[PDB]
Each structure stands twice: as structure tokens, then as C-alpha cells.
Design a protein around this ligand. Structure first.
Ligand SMILES: OC[C@H]1O[C@H](O[C@H]2[C@H](O)[C@@H](O)[C@@H](O)O[C@@H]2CO)[C@H](O)[C@@H](O)[C@@H]1O
Ligand SMILES: OC[C@H]1O[C@H](O[C@H]2[C@H](O)[C@@H](O)[C@@H](O)O[C@@H]2CO)[C@H](O)[C@@H](O)[C@@H]1O
Length: 490
């Protein structure tokens, strides 16, 4: 049956649907929009559950009222929900039309200890997320950053138990960094970064610096220092000593640093996911993390932008599969956030390979046998974008004799806006949804298309870093069709 080729479609809700004062502003307005989505066949929606709004008053001072009202409305409208545990700030990244800081009480601590923030070589502190450096530092009124994230998720589970039991929530996206993605904030618009700048390493806070220094001493090179020749945000790789041909990134020192730098993220995600699994143990939901799509400089040997973001990916070292393997012990979904771009849409001097990057990441996931999902990075309403998303959702097309050998677990569209509901735009969107569903009508019961959700099981045993890094071995991607067999047209 064709229904087995069905890929669910989700739509992100507007940023700030519940304001910074913890008020669900316009229920009636959202309702009309939600009803529009329901009639269009959309399976569900995605929303940020902002840590800065909910635990604003103080440690463990949670107020879930506004969000309960939102979830209630989503349920009445017949849609499922992907809830994001948003432990980051809204405001400094692309598309952020509203400012939502992390808890003020945490910010207060940052006033006396600026090292709780990601810091660049020049000393600028980025306040959008707590540095992985303090994950296990008990400096937040007795709690460590990970304990804060853990308590938050447990309180969410307990206070939203009725919604979880009714099966409203499809998956829990655990924010792991800027924009909720597992990465370092290497390309901060707030600091003047501009596409396609290579970005900057963000390992200069006192905690990471101390860890690095101890690490190199144990490796037998206590004299090694953090990179000092990687240039600045808007540089080009060839103009730096670190990323140029035969540069520092290829030396024993550079390789050690890069491994250390990227390993911190793997451990960051792995440990917080352990907490997320405990908090939702037994609940009928799945866990997911977000991986940023850094396609610029992907076509040159140095992969500069990826390296500064924490993805140690080169042509002879897969920096993404290790993440997928890490996710398998948690039975988690890898949500890749850049799925709609084509190489020809990027200026040529940016050396962008979004299409090749996608193929590498998705293949890695299916290779490791984990579920892969995705989102479009930028607002798009044209058929070319939709056709590209549909192509990546089912790389080898539909199978009339059963399930496709390869398919994504789901796609979340960014974002719900009045522009989307405009007659013509919404018309095309409806076709996109239809094709994602493989020409089948909306299907209410996920079990029909082999997406039944069972109670979350405890994570499998910890996988040692060495076994994880074995996944760096380059593999050939699965074959992609040149264009989808389920085009939207027009
Ligand atoms: O982390 C947010 C967002 O960053 C990237 O989006 C890029 C985009 O690819 C470029 O074309 C350009 O417009 O700059 C954007 C960043 O400001 C990632 O591609 C995306 O996955 C991620 O969510
Ligand atoms: O509301 C979700 C998320 O949206 C924005 O970040 C996006 C980014 O704009 C896109 O590139 C995308 O597909 O991935 C990111 C995460 O989904 C906001 O900047 C972020 O704060 C918010 O959590």
C-alpha cells in the first residue's frame, strides 16, 4: 500500500506565540490559523518551550499555565506536537523577530562569572547559551547546568502528563545549543558575522581553556595553546594560517585541538540526552536533537565553517556519523535543519554544497540505523524548494510494492506566517503536503504508515568515545535520484 511511503509534515508555530511575560497572547488568532493547517492535511506543529519564560522567577520557579493553554488548543484542533526544550535565547539568529533571553537569575550569575558563556578569542561573551564548559559545574545556586536542564524536563513531563498520555506530543526536541542546535555559536550575527564568513572557534571561556590545557599536558604537549591563527568571523579560509593549505588544522597540534573541540559536543549531547531519557522514561514519545546545516566551505578541503561550529568533518573524516551513532543508544531522531537548498542557489565564492552535505548526513543516519528528520533553513514558498525537500524525504522515490528503502521520519516546515496562508502560497503548500503524503489523504493514525510510537525505553549502555570515533571512517552515500518522482509542479 502507498500509505507506507507517507512522510509526516509538521509546521513550526510563530516565535513568541507565548510572550516573554508568559502569556498566550492571541488564542483566537492562532486557532483560525491552526484550523487552516488541519484542513490542509498537516500532521502536527512544532513549538519552542522557552526556558527563559518558564523558569524566569527563580530556580525551580516554573509556570506552565500559558503552555498548558496552548497545548490544549493544539489538541482541540486535531494536530500533534513536537515540543522543543528551548534552553537558548531567541533574538540573535536569522529570522528571530522577538527577544527571549535565558532566565534572568542565570544572567545575574553571569554578571559575576562571565565564563558561563561561550567566549571567542577576543573575549566577547555570547549570552544565548551556557557553555558546555559549565555542564557539570555546580555554580548555579547549587545546581550544574545539566541538572537545571534535567529538572526542567522532569517538571515538563509531570505537569504535562495528561497531554503526554493522550498522545498529543509526538517527539521531544532537546535543545543543545544556539538555536537549539548541537553546535558552538561560531557564526553570530550579533557579533557582526556575515554569510559566508568562516566563523570563529568558541572555546575561550576559562572552563574550556583549562580543560584544553590539562588535555594537551596529558598528551605530552603542555605548551600547546588554543588556535591563534584562525582569523576572524568574516575571513576566508585561505587568508588564515589555520585553514590554509598545509595549515595548522593539518598538524598534530591542530588535529588534537579539533578532536577535543568536537568531542566536547558529542559528550555534551550524550549526557543531556541521558537526562532527557530519564525524564520521559515510559512516555509514548521519541527524543530528537537538531544538527545545523553548515554548507558553506563544504566544497573546499578545510571545511572551515563546519570545523568552527564543532563538526569535525573533512573529506577523509566523517564528522557527522559519530553523532548518529551516539544517538542510537538513545533511540533518538537526528533532525537536520537545512533540507531545501540547491547548490546553484548559493553564490559561487561561498563554496557551498548543501545538496552533498544533506546526502552525507542522511546516509550516515540510515547507515547507523537511526531515524532521520529535517527542516528547511530559510522561508521558502516556491515549488523548487518543496520539490527538493520531497526529494530528500524519499531519495529513491516511492515504492509501489511496499515501504521505500529509504525515507525520512518527518519534515518540519518553517514557519507559520500570514505569508504562508496567502492564497497562492497556501495553494502550493497543499500540494507539497499531498506529495509528502505520497498522494494519500491525511492519515490520523501513525500506525497505518508504520510510525506507531511505543513507550520510551531506557537508553542503551554508554558507548565509549573510541567506538564513537570509529564512525569517522568515510563511507559512500546512498544513491540519490536526480529529481523526485512526486513533483509539486508550478
Ligand atoms: O543556526 C541557524 C541556521 O544556520 C544556518 O543557516 C544559514 C543559511 O544556510 C545560509 O544560507 C545563510 O542565510 O545564513 C544562515 C545562518 O544565519 C544553517 O544552514 C541552518 O541549518 C541553521 O538552522
Ligand atoms: O522555532 C524553532 C527555532 O527556529 C529558529 O532557528 C532555526 C533556524 O531559523 C532554521 O535554520 C532552522 O531550520 O533551524 C533552527 C532550529 O529549528 C530560531 O532561531 C530558534 O531560536 C528556534 O528554536
Amino acid at each position: 500500500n502507498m500509505l507506507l511511503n507517507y512522510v509526516p509534515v509538521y509546521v513550526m508555530l510563530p516565535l513568541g506565540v507565548v510572550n516573554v511575560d508568559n502569556v498566550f497572547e492571541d488564542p483566537d488568532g492562532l486557532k483560525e490559523q491552526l484550523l487552516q493547517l488541519r484542513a490542509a492535511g498537516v500532521d502536527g506543529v512544532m513549538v519552542d518551550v522557552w526556558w527563559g519564560i518558564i523558569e524566569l522567577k527563580g530556580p525551580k520557579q516554573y509556570d506552565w499555565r500559558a503552555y498548558r493553554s496552548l497545548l490544549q488548543l493544539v489538541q482541540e484542533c486535531g494536530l500533534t506536537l513536537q515540543a522543543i526544550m528551548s534552553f537558548h535565547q531567541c533574538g540573535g539568529n536569522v529570522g528571530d523577530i522577538v527577544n527571549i533571553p535565558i532566565p534572568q537569575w542565570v544572567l545575574d550569575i553571569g554578571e559575576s562569572n562571565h565564563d558561563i558563556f561561550y567566549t571567542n578569542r577576543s573575549g566577547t561573551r555570547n549570552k544565548e547559551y551556557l557553555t558546555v564548559g559549565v555542564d557539570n559545574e555546580p555554580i548555579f545556586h547549587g545546581r550544574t547546568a545539566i541538572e537545571i536542564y534535567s529538572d526542567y524536563m522532569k517538571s515538563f513531563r509531570e505537569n504535562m502528563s495528561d497531554f503526554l498520555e493522550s498522545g498529543l506530543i509526538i517527539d521531544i526536541e532537546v535543545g543543545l545549543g544556539p538555536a537549539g542546535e548541537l553546535r558552538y555559536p561560531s557564526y553570530p550575527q550579533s557579533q557582526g558575522w556575515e554569510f559566508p564568513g568562516i566563523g570563529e572557534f568558541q572555546c575561550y571561556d576559562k572552563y574550556l581553556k583549562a580543560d584544553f590545557k590539562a588535555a594537551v599536558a596529558r598528551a605530552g604537549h603542555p605548551e600547546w595553546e588554543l588556535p591563534d591563527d584562525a582569523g576572524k568571523y568574516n575571513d576566508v579560509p585561505e587568508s588564515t594560517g589555520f585553514f590554509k593549505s598545509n595549515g595548522t588544522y593539518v598538524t598534530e597540534k591542530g588535529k588534537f585541538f579539533l578532536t577535543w573541540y568536537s568531542n566536547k559536543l558529542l559528550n555534551h549531547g550524550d549526557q543531556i540526552l541521558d537526562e532527557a531519557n530519564k525524564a520521559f522514561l515510559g512516555c509514548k514519545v521519541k527524543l530528537a536533537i537538531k544538527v545545523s546545516g553548515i554548507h558553506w566551505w563544504y566544497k573546499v578541503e578545510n571545511h572551515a565553517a563546519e570545523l568552527t561550529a564543532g563538526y569535525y568533518n573533512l573529506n577523509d573524516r566523517d564528522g557527522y556519523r559519530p553523532i548518529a551513532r551516539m544517538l542510537s543508544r538513545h533511540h533518538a531522531i537526528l533532525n537536520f535543519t537545512c533540507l531545501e537548498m540547491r547548490d546553484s542557489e548559493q553564490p559561487s565564492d561561498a563554496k557551498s554544497g548543501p545538496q552533498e552535505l544533506v546526502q552525507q548526513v542522511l546516509s550516515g543516519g540510515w547507515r547507523e540505523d537511526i531515524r532521520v528528520a529535517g527542516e528547511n533553513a530559510l522561508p521558502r514558498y516556491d515549488a523548487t524548494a518543496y520539490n527538493q525537500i520531497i526529494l530528500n524525504a524519499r531519495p529513491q522515490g516511492v515504492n509501489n510494492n511496499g515501504p521505500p528503502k529509504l525515507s525520512m521520519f518527518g519534515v518540519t516546515y518553517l514557519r507559520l506566517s500570514d505569508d504562508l496562508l496567502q492564497k497562492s502560497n497556501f495553494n502550493i503548500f497543499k500540494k507539497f503536503v499531498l506529495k509528502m503524503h505520497a498522494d494519500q489523504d491525511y492519515c490520523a493514525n501513525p500506525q497505518k504508515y508504520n510510525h506507531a510510537i511505543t513507550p520510551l525505553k531506557p537508553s542503551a549502555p554508554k558507548i565509549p568515545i573510541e567506538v564513537l570515533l570509529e564512525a569517522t571512517k568515510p563511507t559512500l552515500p546512498f544513491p540519490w535520484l536526480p529529481e523526485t518522482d512526486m513533483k509539486v509542479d508550478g
